[PDB]
Amino acid sequence: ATVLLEVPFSARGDRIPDAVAELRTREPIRKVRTITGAEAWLVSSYALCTQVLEDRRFSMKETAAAGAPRLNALTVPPEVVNNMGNIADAGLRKAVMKAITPKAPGLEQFLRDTANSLLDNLITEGAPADLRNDFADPLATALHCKVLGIPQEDGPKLFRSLSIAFMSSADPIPAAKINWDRDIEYMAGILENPNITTGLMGELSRLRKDPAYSHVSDELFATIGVTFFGAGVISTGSFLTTALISLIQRPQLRNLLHEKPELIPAGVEELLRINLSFADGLPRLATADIQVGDVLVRKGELVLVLLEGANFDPEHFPNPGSIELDRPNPTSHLAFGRGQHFCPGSALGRRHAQIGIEALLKKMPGVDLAVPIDQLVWRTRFQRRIPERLPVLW
């Protein structure tokens, strides 16, 4: 006798378990047990993953309901699971979206200047360098302070909430509330601070005093700042870190992109496709009885959409483990999700990674791991897969 298959399968972000392809072939929707003890349906084919993500009857917001089967414990107030819906209901979606595009004047130059400064400092200090803690995460933090309009010197403290805020825990996390409440107070202070006139928080600060938004709550304005900083920084820092591993492990691709940087966008799109940064399937709660493949999912059941299931499905991406810069369907991966909840930061995340990689390959064309790959320490029970340190030489 064996227990019900447990998720997640592996916290390693440098390889997909052979188990994923066996599951997809034999049982592309199947029952699993999460870290809380709840049962859920794990969906691992491209066709069924897109079906779930394009049917709002599989609800994000309802995952927060009391009594629901849970993937993990909430680390935010339950109403914040519906953050984007709340922004939209408040009439703030176009303004938020506009503030977080990479198109703002000087943003790409800021990204390039910051990346080059971080890299020059690593070159001065000498090898080995830690490309997560001393490149990708500081580049993500600096980018999001600029996008939000808040001082660069406030980045580090907001960043240190994230090793707890994005935990994937069986139980509530006391520290998560301590840091959440503090970060909310910080963002409330920002809205009242007359120096803050640019970026997302500068715009929210103005809209808050506009009569057309007079009944939007102050809680929501502060919440948008905390959630967009946290989601953006953890997602871009973690994605760039694991993309750098995939690139370092492919010297032929590293050399090709170094020699022809015009291919970097197509490279980053493949690095997004094969990325293992999301540690768990995306959760949804059924609000009706719905057929998914051979399973009739019942109302109230938890469904987990395994992004690497979709993104390594050979029926959609032939030779899925290979980075191929000339695929016919290159952006059709699910790295940014799909449907109602498609990532609003997708363009910014692409540009963060493209500029970071462009800068690294110019400054460190001989970049290579400085330890055997198995020596990377993969963070556990977290919503992202990341190595604690990424030691490189060049």
Ligand code: HEM
């Ligand atoms: C490479 C970087 C990024 C990746 C891989 C990524 C990935 C994702 C994914 C897969 C989702 C869908 C979640 C779901 O459907 O359950 C999502 C949603 C979201 N992302 Fe991103 N993201 C990235 C960058 C960013 C950035 C830069 C921001 C903000 C600055 C951001 C903010 C959000 C928000 C607010 C949502 C929720 C949208 C909603 O519920 O409608 N992300 N992201």
Ligand SMILES: Cc1cc(O)cc(C)c1C[C@@H]1NC(=O)[C@H](Cc2ccc(O)cc2)NC1=O
């Ligand atoms: C768990 C968490 C902690 C935190 O301190 C801030 C946030 C935004 C989260 C949310 C968590 N992070 C994700 O990236 C995805 C996508 C998402 C992003 C933002 C959002 O507001 C709603 C959903 N899903 C999550 O549940």
